[PDB]
């Protein structure tokens with residue numbers, strides 16, 4: 341039974357219920373994420389920005405089955421074109437807007453990766469991707485407004501691939517946490 345999360349802490353409690361088992365009801369998880377109305381005071385502790393690139397701030401380690409983190413995107417900060425390592429990936433905007441560009445998996449032949457579509461993700465919206473849907477790039481294209489997003493990955497993963505848009509070639513990268521549970525982790 342899916343109720344509206346009243347606070348971020350309430351959302352986290354609900355997520356622990358939704359991931360108590362071995363499978364994932366994507367539509368339910370996305371609906372509850374969308375229904376939490378971002379309250380900046382509740383997540384300020386995790387919103388630790390870096391001047392030069394976006395940061396990943398761990399909020400909850402889940403039950404072994406999922407990670408929940410907040411990503412903080414300065415003006416003009418963006419990601420690589422990335423996969424998600426055979427995991428579910430949910431992305432909910434907490435502040436600002438992000439552009440999501442979708443790409444197909446490359447062919448073996450070296451070729452430019454042409455976007456299949458793009459969309460603007462707006463405050464409180466929750467998007468979803470997995471490797472069967474494709475690859476994506478996420479960007480804060482704003483010149484004036486930082487963005488903050490809430491990400492849930494299941495299972496957790498700390499490596500993925502970045503893809504060279506000019507060739508489709510991939511390289512494994514390890515993802516690091518800028519902070520964990522509100523504590524900066526250099």
Ligand SMILES: [Fe+3]
Nearest residue numbers: 422424429476
């Ligand atoms: Fe992603």
